[model samples]
Target: GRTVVVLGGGISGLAASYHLSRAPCPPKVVLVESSERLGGWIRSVRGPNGAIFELGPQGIRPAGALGARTLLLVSELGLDSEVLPVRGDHPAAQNRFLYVGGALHALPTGLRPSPPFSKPLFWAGLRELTKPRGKEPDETVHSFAQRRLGPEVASLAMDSLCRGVFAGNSRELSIRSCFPSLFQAEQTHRSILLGLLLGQPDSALIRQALAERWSQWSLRGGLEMLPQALETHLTSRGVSVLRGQPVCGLSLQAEGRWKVSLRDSSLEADHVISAIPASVLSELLPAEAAPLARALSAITAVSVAVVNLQYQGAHLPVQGFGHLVPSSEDPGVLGIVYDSVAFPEQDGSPPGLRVTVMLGGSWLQTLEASGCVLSQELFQQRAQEAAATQLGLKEMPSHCLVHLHKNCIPQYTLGHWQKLESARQFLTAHRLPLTLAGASYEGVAVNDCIESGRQAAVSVLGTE
Candidate 1:
């Protein structure tokens, strides 16, 4: 069997190892991580009354290609029974809210405008379908949405979605890089709406996505269980797994082999898969690989603080998935997730209300620029205050869990695709047998990371 080393024992790295282990004529796989833990950001912790909440990504959808791959892996690992589904009629699915103008406005049932916005707002979006198409190489998420959907939609809808997904600023994030499919729709048809709705015949992946209907799901233990399962499977297959063994550097070796150097040792591999972040990859490569390194280093990352609050016998301020505040409101809170409401069973019996308040996206950056001191305690306090002021919470929380993740999510800012292209060109030109996969490049979700790992294994194995 061929030898392949995977760096960064996160979800992506584990997924890469798992796929490679199962490939036709499986390779000798080795996974190494700087940290002792394996899951990376997918962490789950328990609170008072046996309440479990996620510090990183709480849940995932069962709709897209990523979701399918995840489910397939779960089944292969015999973890099918552990999967918990949030039904289509769950409050989280129906009752998403936008906290605007100091009031909670329930997002409209369909694409139509909510109570606060008049019918004209939706009509304005429809009008864009008839507008003449214009050419532009790249644009921000806010700008693209404003042009295609209308300013109101951009601010109210896209802004919240971007906050929830990327924990980013829409005005700075690239539309082409962030929402590739949507951007492709705009490029394919005169109108983005038409392109999205009736543009092309649904491919197998698209049809699978439609069939799934974007329903959300999570493991009974936590999102971490997926990575844990992969780790267990790889170990059982006799894969070399190392923790707390950071790769200090990497270099090309003789006979088309690669040398991965750690703090205490070095290992040679016929091929390598770097499932680590772009920033770390930049440091691992040499100056001769400066172009790729520069591009990777150019990507910006934002910090996010997850504050999980539990209210005992307290009334919920608003039902559904929780509320997202737009930058226009500047509520100091990015968004809130209705954890207990979304998954009551996950919270346990004698149900207590639970909400995960996310802070420190662009909002955190603004605070830092002002030279204001903000600690984790302050973040928790602000989250409680926002709950009382915006959500009209009368009762105080009985328990609180605060998790601070610095430089967590990567920001796909303007000209990001160009950077990726440069990185790809450098990799191809060098004929480096190393494959890049993980949250930094293609996507940030658990499924995306898993799919990226599988793709990398395919690339290394010289199989489609």
Candidate 2:
């Protein structure tokens, strides 16, 4: 029969199925998930001391109405009261460090028009402040930082910056692509601080506006509640979400119909939405879509570990956002995030600091294969060492937990944008009845995922 068979049961896939349910003439939609449970990688675990710690994205950034809308949907679905809205200003992530020559240093600063002299990045940065905002000359982030802030700052600070955000190598990441704002600031205003003070581009304004509205909240039970709520909402509207049925293959059939093969069954779909990872999709896609598949295969994905350590004390000394160990300066690990500090109200505890550490990336698989116990070691000793080294607290934590996320982060390396556009355009042209979306394209945030899902739903329903 003709039905819209959505592959994958992650948030992206579920959101698409849910959206279809809202459509007046929504097709008989059947969603298949390989995993037993939904929500994909979103999860939260309770520590030994009864502190709830996130295994995946700890906080949602309401940097736009999209985030607000997702929240509103959550509220409407009866999860609103479960979320705790925070008051007052929380600190933005603090300065990052790069490990260089066995020492940590703050990241390079001032690619803006006017920067504070108190900036500790480098003396040469001040010189750049005076020099005209020069045109970019094909230099990487590592190169720019070295030229402006000195080699020491670049190695340590830039390393931490990459670990904090991308969890990948900075030198390998493009300057003009990943962080165009800094690049543009140097080009236009000739100062990093100037851009910070004045802000940049049309998109930056939207972010600033959204930052003002973000609330610190999590599921009372766990982070999985939001996705479950979405599922219920969509189900009520008539979408059939079938978990444990992995969509193994896809083929183009007669009359513009697509044949999707599950482990136990085969079905026809008028429109198909592949909201799963591009790597997985490449394997499932037909031979005609082989080029797109290969291109997707080239975009690599890596695994990382998130370590959550809890310390007990009536008065925790950590009062601000946590810090990162820049790759250049941080050789062993990424950095620690002050989860407790970030969300004071959300800390359901007897009062203390809950530090979350993020590590591993493209290099993680190798480390694990070599029989390294970095994940477990970090949960015990490294947690304490990080506190002593970064926070000046060498005392043992009251509780510690570590989660190893295998083969997660999808890399959008050099030439990634071109590959994505090429693949997407090809699919759209064939009217091939398939839609692909994920962090590989626009973004990696929770909101971005929802946006991807929504757009995918629109594409699928529109074609019908």
Candidate 3:
């Protein structure tokens, strides 16, 4: 029977649609995407000199549940051979830096502060030895880090870490929701550093699950190759991968059927698995589910602008994976990825340097206050400025490309989980043939989102 309609065509949607269609005597699966492009944040661009620039996430790390499920799909899709990796021991992988006091400082692997380190930071490292525990239900990443690691590590390292990943400031994000791994670590050992060193004193079979090293990887053709591969394979397997059409509304019909409404068209489904964003889904929900929609609306989004800047050889003042600017530095940029140095396979330019600059995270609000409008022009200007001042470049860049993501990644702020709990309860009460998947439910990480889609597809097909 035609049973499933998957909304959204990102990797999560792809995973959901793929899993559903391949199930034994499975229900017919159709995926609807708002835009023609399939992969949401998985964007890679081609340039003049056979160069490649990542407008979205750059690489994939295969580890834990995230790595296992993705590798399974990669092996099945025959994309394993296409994977290019940066080994764990690579210098670029090892040398992570922080922009502090108008200078770059390499992060220490041993948790010991290096020379010129202030007494406070050195004391902060040993603060974990002081026996710290927390009872608070929730707190921001900054507060949590500041409490456990001390103020120096929080403002310098933790703040940039949050900016690099979520593109949001840590002061407002939830420690329990956004960085739950740390929360789990703190709860079990009463010290985050101790938990980082020694996992649960006793755990059967699971402790070794994450014991393996992880490598950063990307596809040979590009990140976009994934959606193209999935679309080709899915259509061959009788799955409908619809593009350029958005699911505008959802309604529950009799016999656990769902009415999926699009622009000027509609279809009936035995079940609906939504992999779209939470904020987007809130608007599409039925008026009768107003309370649920209200709950989901509590989830918020942050914007990011990615800039790919190219340069000639011998221009770099320093080397490493790149550098992250702490909000305290007031650098108009988030971080820079030394692209060609680490993952040389992706580069096609004449022996030269390449870096990816990210700007406009939570800093978008700061720029707006200074009368800067959100636009490609402003983003490009900011990166060029950073390249000259922060990066110490002598000449202008050879090429620059900018991609602005408007309200892209979800900000798992305080109360994020409680909102999802309300939505979960609403679905339980109504018993509708609908399941929320991907970033809407939990796990905003790319691999986490893909795993969620697989689980949702499996759940929707239960008892069959």
Candidate 4:
């Protein structure tokens, strides 16, 4: 039987396996995960009294092509009832903040001007309309922001966005790798701001996105439900999910097949969808692919600590989504998501404020080496104080759940695309039956990861 081995049991791998299992001419599918769990970073802990704390991503962007794909998958999996949709008019959808100048500044939703973002910054927006394209093929998001929107906005706004979205350093994170849509906008329209305003070219999917009233949504059980559903669906379709089994090594055979070495046994796969991190894939690749492996090492990741703080009888100072901390002014936290208010339906009995303070990311760069326990205590201390002070709570949080995810979010540093291109070059040159998927490459969000997995499946299915 023709076999396809999917490494890593995360959303990407599971998604890959799911699509492969459901293919028109389905191949034998084996999904190997290093850990017992299948969800990877999309984890949710059931706190006291039906409360759920999300350890990884708090919400999914349910708009445009990416969102349409995820929503379609959800519908297919019968997860519509499970979804908790946050409407466009919801406070969480309408409001957000950026911490700069040692204060939480409300991000402008409309044309009305706000403090910190001086009139000069607004003038820069005008200049960007007539700005010429850059000479470099790829540049840092900060550089682009500075060139187009001026340094003040770049330093404050762009930095916060990078820390919030990618847990990445805007100074080093490539605009192309991290924000491809924005890159495409600049290339196509010559002005990123104008291109954004014009939006993507139209299609049925575009119409679907434009007509959607929902802003974002998550499962009642949590984001983990998607992967669980995928796994269940795959199992029902005879897809083998091998959990707690890590692939130790990989090699290309003469017939252009892959030999994946696991803990005890091995699988000879006609194609492999490597959903593991670039760092892990580097080690697994054969010695002959050392150059590509070396390039993979450049695609490093960042650690993030999710601190879910529950304050009984406390009211948030402001409404809307959580605030993002600028890389310059931020101590350790990237941002805090307004969990309780965002989805009150999942709140604990007699609930108060339940906000998730995301610490680390690029900020935790130097802190992990100092004992894990120490880091946990320090993170808790910071989150407790930050949440209380920021929200002006009278008393401290009643309970706190702190989870440190080591090397969780992959950082798309400058030259990330180049590294990927070279890796693709080497793999294609050797005619290796391998497909790369997941956060380590183009996309990190669950939606993007799902697309990557589906795309990977399509490519391999084409060869068949």
Question: For each candidate, C-alpha RMSD in Å?
Answer: 2.9, 5.0, 3.6, 2.4
Model 3 C-alpha lDDT per residue in residues 76-111, reported as the tens digit of each score: 788766766666656676777787777787877654
Weakest 10 consecutive residues of candidate 2 by summed lDDT: 109-118
TM-score (C-alpha) between model 3 and the true structure:
0.92
lDDT of 1 by residue, 24-139 (tens): 78878899999988988988886556678899987887655567767777778877677777666556767888888889888876545465576646686578787666478788
lDDT for each residue of candidate 4 in 166-218, tens digit (9 for 90 to 100): 88789988999898988988999989887898872344433443465667888
Native-referenced Cα lDDT, model 2: 0.66
Full ranking by lDDT: 4, 1, 3, 2
Model 1 superposed RMSD (Cα) = 2.9
In order, what lDDT does every prediction score?
Answer: 0.82, 0.66, 0.78, 0.84
lDDT-better candidate, 1 vs 2? 1
In candidate 1, which residue pairs clash? none
Between candidates 2 and 3, name the one with more favorable lDDT.
3
lDDT of 3: 0.78
Q: Give lDDT tens digits, candidate 2, residues 1-464.
A: 34887777777877778777777777788887888878877877765555678888776655446766566556557775566443335443433343344444444333421221134444555665765544544456676666656575566556567666667776766555556677677766767657656761134323433455444445666677778788778678767777788788988866878888889888788878887888888898888888788877777666777777766662334454456665544444677767776665445657666777777744465676787666477545655676666666566777777777776666546666677777877876776677787665655567767778888888778765
Please tell me which model should have the higher TM-score, number 1 or number 2.
1
Look at candidate 4 and give me any clashing residue pairs: none
